[PDB]
């Protein structure tokens, strides 16, 4: 869809691999405001919004907090306290028809500036002069939208650009599994546990929903692994005086 009708999709309650997102393809623009790209996977937030729109190359710079222009004031606005990323790449191959692609349109003027994260869909005729116009376009009265001159022979400043903006607990990406060892005391960390000791097998019978196991004096003595549902024991490797 066009910039004047930018689509928004909500992401929640699923695992997102942020690092793989940059490695999927090549993006000419990748700017994150308030977000560290290195620690992109090291985040855990609640609400994710992916706003996307098509603009030309020269309008890419207007997609940032505290920016001014036709698109920034009439098509899409980013709040000054925006906490997210801006990703853009050229789309002159699949998103550029041969000869004045008229499918994409943009807004040129309005009665007031757009609030952040607000979309305008009205097609009311804009009154640009004292002479009134009632549903009729003409003198001092023009359509709020104009067609893009998307041509393959146009320069990179006018070439089409599809821009994806990511705006930010149920959204996080876990990793780092590892194999298992036996009959040798090591340092272990299951989901929410830590301690040192040796792990062997056991003959205890659990219940279909129990994970840990505690003896008297509140000390762990049995753990179930979350990969093969196999019981285990925990005894500490030796210590004593000299």
């Amino acid at each position: 869809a066009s910039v004047y009708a930018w689509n928004r999709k909500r992401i929640s309650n699923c695992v997102a691999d942020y690092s793989v997102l940059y490695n999927s393809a090549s993006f000419s623009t990748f700017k994150c405001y308030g977000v560290s790209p290195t620690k992109l996977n090291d985040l855990c937030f609640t609400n994710v919004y992916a706003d996307s729109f098509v603009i030309r190359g020269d309008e890419v710079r207007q997609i940032a907090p505290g920016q001014t222009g036709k698109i920034a004031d009439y098509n899409y606005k980013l709040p000054d306290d925006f906490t997210g990323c801006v990703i853009a790449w050229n789309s002159n191959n699949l998103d550029s028809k041969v000869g004045g692609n008229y499918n994409y349109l943009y807004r040129l003027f309005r009665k007031s500036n757009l609030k952040p994260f607000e979309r305008d869909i009205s097609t009311e005729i804009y009154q640009a002069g004292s002479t009134p116009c009632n549903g009729v376009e003409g003198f001092n009265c023009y359509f709020p939208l104009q067609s893009y001159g998307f041509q393959p022979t146009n320069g990179v400043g006018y070439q089409p650009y599809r821009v994806v903006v990511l705006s930010f607990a149920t959204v996080c990406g876990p990793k780092k599994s590892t194999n298992l060892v036996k009959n040798k005391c090591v340092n272990f960390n299951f989901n929410g546990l830590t301690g040192t000791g040796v792990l062997t097998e056991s003959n205890k019978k659990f219940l279909p929903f129990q994970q840990f196991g505690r003896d008297i004096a509140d000390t762990t003595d049995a753990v179930r692994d979350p990969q093969t549902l196999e019981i285990l024991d925990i005894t500490p490797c030796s210590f004593g005086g000299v």
């Epitope: 869809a1 066009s2 004045g100 008229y102 499918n103 023009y142 104009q146 067609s147 893009y148 001159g149």
Partner: nanobody
Framework: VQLVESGGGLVQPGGSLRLSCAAS????????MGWFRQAPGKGRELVAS????????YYPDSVEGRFTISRDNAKRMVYLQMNSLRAEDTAVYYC??????????????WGQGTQVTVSS
């Protein structure tokens, strides 16, 4: 390019009515139609607007919850289903076809128009 409008006669308040117009001739650069309303004592007004490229329809607050617009790309058809008709809807309905110049300025084609009356 020629806009021919069909349908729309005399109806009763609280009824339903659908209007369809066909565009034939030169292919339009921009996929954008619309419906207009001209009251006998007032000027042209906005009823609905559909793009098709984005599949997003816009309605004014006056008829946001009563007027629905649909399009048929294969037959070059557009439809405007009118529900919960009131006495204020008695006007002539027009069809608009939007085209663009080489520079990019959007044009507009005005149809013949169909008279719609809501009488008890």
């Amino acid at each position: 390019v020629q806009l021919v409008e069909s349908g729309g006669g005399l109806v009763q308040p609280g009824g339903s009515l659908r209007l369809s117009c066909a565009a034939s001739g030169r292919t339009f650069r921009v996929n954008l139609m619309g419906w207009f309303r001209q009251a006998p004592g007032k000027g042209r007004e906005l009823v609905a607007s559909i793009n098709g490229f984005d599949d997003i329809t816009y309605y004014p607050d006056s008829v946001e919850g009563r007027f629905t617009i649909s399009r048929d790309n294969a037959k070059r058809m557009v439809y405007l289903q009118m529900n919960s008709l009131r006495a204020e809807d008695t006007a002539v309905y027009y069809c608009a076809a939007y085209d663009s110049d080489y520079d990019g300025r959007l044009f507009n084609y005005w149809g013949q128009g169909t008279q719609v009356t809501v009488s008890s």
